Enzyme design. Sequence first.
Site: not given
Length: 237
Positions: A87, A40, A180
């Site tokens: 995100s 991201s 992540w």
Amino acid sequence: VQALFNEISADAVFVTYDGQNIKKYGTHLDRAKTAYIPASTFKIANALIGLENHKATSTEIFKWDGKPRFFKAWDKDFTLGEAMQASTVPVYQELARRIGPSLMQSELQRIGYGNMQIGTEVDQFWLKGPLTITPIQEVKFVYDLAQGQLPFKPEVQQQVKEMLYVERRGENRLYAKSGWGMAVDPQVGWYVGFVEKADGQVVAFALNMQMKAGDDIALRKQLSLDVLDKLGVFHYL
């Protein structure tokens, strides 16, 4: 500083850039020159490319399609700015499809982002590859963003900078993005950004760490804030 890395058995590195000097802190320094999917963190580039190429605006509202997303938090309308902070992957997947596989590839190559590879699927490449980028590449990139020195229009770089605005401590400002990469083995953890210090000095940072499956979401940011405090870049208020 040195304890607060392995005290958790973390395979990680922290990089700082001041526009002349690269500094490396952590348990595993070689991660800094090692390439990983951006995950991201790529949203920073994605927005830049979309804005520059007239495929989206900073004010436009990306409305929920009504179908449940990965987090219930994402089950609402987002600006690119809001989606940046949450995100919200589905919003940026949409942006990327507006952009397209030829344009996205050309632009990434144009700006020299990571290994510059995206492959067939325009809405997956940052999440599973083959796009890869080192932590050193990440710090230089955001640092350049901070200084408005990337190959984008000045107004575009400013608009994205504002999207990244996380916290103000007194005269100092924090800009950051999280990543992540779950869909890869092993998982990789990012916290990337810069601090606009009171003295007018900019310091860019990148945390890159191995993610041991489902550990706490807040860990990446907490460590970076701690390290930033320990370094005297962004003291705790």
